[PDB]
Amino acid sequence: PDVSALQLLSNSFESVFDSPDDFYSDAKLVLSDGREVSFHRCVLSARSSFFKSALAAAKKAVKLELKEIAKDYEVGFDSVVTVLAYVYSSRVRPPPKGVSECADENCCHVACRPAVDFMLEVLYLAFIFKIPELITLYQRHLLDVVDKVVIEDTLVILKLANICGKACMKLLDRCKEIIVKSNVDMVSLEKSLPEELVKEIIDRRKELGLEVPKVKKHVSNVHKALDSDDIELVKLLLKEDHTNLDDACALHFAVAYCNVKTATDLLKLDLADVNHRNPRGYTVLHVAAMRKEPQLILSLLEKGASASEATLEGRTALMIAKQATMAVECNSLKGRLCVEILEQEDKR
Amino acid sequence: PDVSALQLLSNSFESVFDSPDDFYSDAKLVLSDGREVSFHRCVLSARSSFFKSALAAAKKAVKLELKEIAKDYEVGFDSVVTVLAYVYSSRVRPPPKGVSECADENCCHVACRPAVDFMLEVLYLAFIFKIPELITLYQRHLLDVVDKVVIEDTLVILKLANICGKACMKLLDRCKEIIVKSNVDMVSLEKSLPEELVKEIIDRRKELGLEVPKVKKHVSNVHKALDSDDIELVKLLLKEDHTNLDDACALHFAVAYCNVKTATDLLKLDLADVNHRNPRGYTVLHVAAMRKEPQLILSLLEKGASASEATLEGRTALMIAKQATMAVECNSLKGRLCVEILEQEDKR
């Protein structure tokens, strides 16, 4: 094969992508936020069969709404730029620094949440666009990375693997194995994963010999009472002396999945240990840092939350809040607000 | 670099070129014959600067007439197909059987007229389109084949090499040297090359001390009389007995460059040997076969012409007629008419 001619072809089409208006661009992919990427119909009709069928149906002044043809996973703009650059020039283009990097200067950005999110979005784009080489490349990257990612992000990775159909069998199997190997509570799974997925996971946990404890009836009642805003039902359930907020991890549940005011009320009741540790091994401060809600963090610190405690992996709430926030937010600014609150409190 | 993705890109673009209507073709290139080729504006605006400028000027359904942009040389259809295939996939598509092959079945079609003509057309197209790699590849081809091609075709190769300016400098130089080292008639140089090339070749020929005799004034007078289609003037000159048709090779001149009717009227006088040779070794019938004019060959065969005589290179009239026509015409039908006339005269 003649490598030089192919390299010149790739360079010419990369220069085409780098200045689409200069080379007679005839289509525009609009994202969910409002940004636009100008692309040519011939290139994407050739490389992507999905784009061929979509442009053939739209042609029955050409715009494609990405929020409609995807409609299963919100994808950023830099991931779209990477996918289109690979479609045009057959080479992967790294995103601008900050999109696939977290706000922790000690993090290598191999397994932190921004990098995982970018990889997930690009893989979903490659699946929707029907590009098998990019799908395999990023499936291998995610398989090499899931072992070092926090389990709460492994949940989202497994969600994407389930959405991406049979094109990610290896990723789906690895994620199911990692989840059933750990001691993840059923609550989160049922409130995040779909019904058939949680049922399959529970069936595999039962048949594989691994222990699957029965969901405590009163704990389930407390959780259902917490999901439905009704503080009087919570008082009625607590007046029976048959329940304990620490034994049910009600603070963790309210901070992770419930509304801000519900957690604030449960904290003002002063009926649960703030520094209590859940079966997973996390404190309420770590869950608050993951949730990224400033009111909960302020109410926790104002109630006596100890910030020097570390998790099983040795991360304190500050490192979790750093690894959970995007780097561009410290150069939605709700993450930056939490980061600055935690930095200001750490200074005292 | 990853070669696999590049080859998939190339295959996708080859599928685009093979069916341009299925990939939103937005421009058309019309040939001199009447045929037309569909192509995309972005691809050729990126691969070639000439098309970028032409389309940007036309934009100030797009049709481009090849006879207007490239006006000084009639290029075929298969040459355009090959150049566009290289534009779309960076892959040199071979020409169809018959185009690069002549009528002769005793030839390997490696240095015959149809092949050199196809190479010349493709090289001129690559020069007009400013694709330097294609230019270099076919310039290499022409230097490899030129050392075996008969001088008469090397004249046309030199003509196009000068048309390509300073880009095909190597082919030009080679052609020049070859022509200088050959005993080409002065009239052939005047009627095949512009004044600049003739003067340059004469200066180089005279600087090396080669045998470059001048043209007799009376012979020049008879030749100019023949060029003006004034047979009666030539008659009065022969009445003066200043010139003779044998020493002037008026039959060769009339058959090679002058009009058909002038050569017919000159033959109708019967004042010169038809089977006479020239300093290059060709008889009148051989030149008639080289020109592919059926009426001249017919009038020579009706008056008396030995068809079994060969040139200095060993080519007979049948061989010249076969090697001057392309294999498409035996599988303008003027060459086919000449070849069939001469094959009939063979068994006669």
Binding site: - | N221, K224, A225, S228, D229, D230, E232, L233, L236, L237, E240, H242, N259, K261
Partner: protein, 210 residues
């Protein structure tokens, strides 16, 4: 002057027909038409020049002075005029390179024609100079003095018109003898060259008059 207006309209139409005939002979030569039609076109160019000379004679009877003034021609052509028209020896030199190649016999005939035209031009020029000096002297008489003046005026007008007639005769003779020396094709090429020469001169006049 009705006669001079008529002359100028005839000359305009002559120029239009000259342009038409030159275009036709150019197209015919380029199309390699047969000798018979080309000879017809040559003999029609010759007829058209003859028609020019008749109209010039008509203008000469009406106003000989107008013809010598040359103001009915374009500015650059006036630089070459001789007794009411062009000098045949110079037009012969102009067209000679285009009727090439000439035979030895044709070459001798053309040079002989050129010599005879030159001698006739010199003799006519000397005669006109002598006439004009006599006109100066004779005019200088009537103004000083308060039968003979009218007769002298008429005789002198007859002499001037005769000189114009002889110059037109010389041009027509030179044209017809060039048309007889040369073959049909060669003559056609010469007439084409002459016509393009005149057209180029008129174009240069239009360019200098912008």
């Amino acid at each position: 002057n009705s006669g001079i207006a008529a002359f100028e309209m005839e000359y305009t139409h002559w120029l239009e027909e000259q342009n038409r005939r030159v275009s036709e002979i150019r197209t015919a030569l380029q199309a390699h038409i047969g000798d018979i039609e080309l000879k017809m076109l040559v003999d029609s160019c010759l007829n058209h020049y003859a028609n020019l000379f008749r109209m010039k004679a008509d203008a000469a009877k009406a106003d000989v002075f107008f013809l010598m003034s040359g103001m009915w021609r374009t500015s650059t052509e006036r630089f070459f005029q001789w007794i009411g028209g062009f000098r045949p020896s110079e037009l012969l030199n102009v067209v000679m390179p285009y009727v090439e190649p000439l035979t030895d016999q044709q070459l001798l005939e053309v040079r002989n024609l050129q010599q005879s035209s030159q001698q006739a031009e010199e003799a006519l020029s000397q005669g006109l100079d002598k006439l004009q000096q006599g006109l100066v002297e004779s005019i200088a008489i009537q103004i000083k003095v308060v039968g003979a003046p009218m007769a002298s005026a008429m005789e002198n007008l007859q002499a001037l018109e005769s000189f114009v007639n002889q110059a037109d005769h010389l041009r027509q003779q030179t044209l017809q003898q060039m048309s007889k020396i040369l073959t049909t094709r060669q003559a056609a090429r010469g007439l084409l060259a002459l016509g393009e020469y005149f057209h180029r001169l008129r174009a240069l006049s239009s360019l200098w008059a912008a």
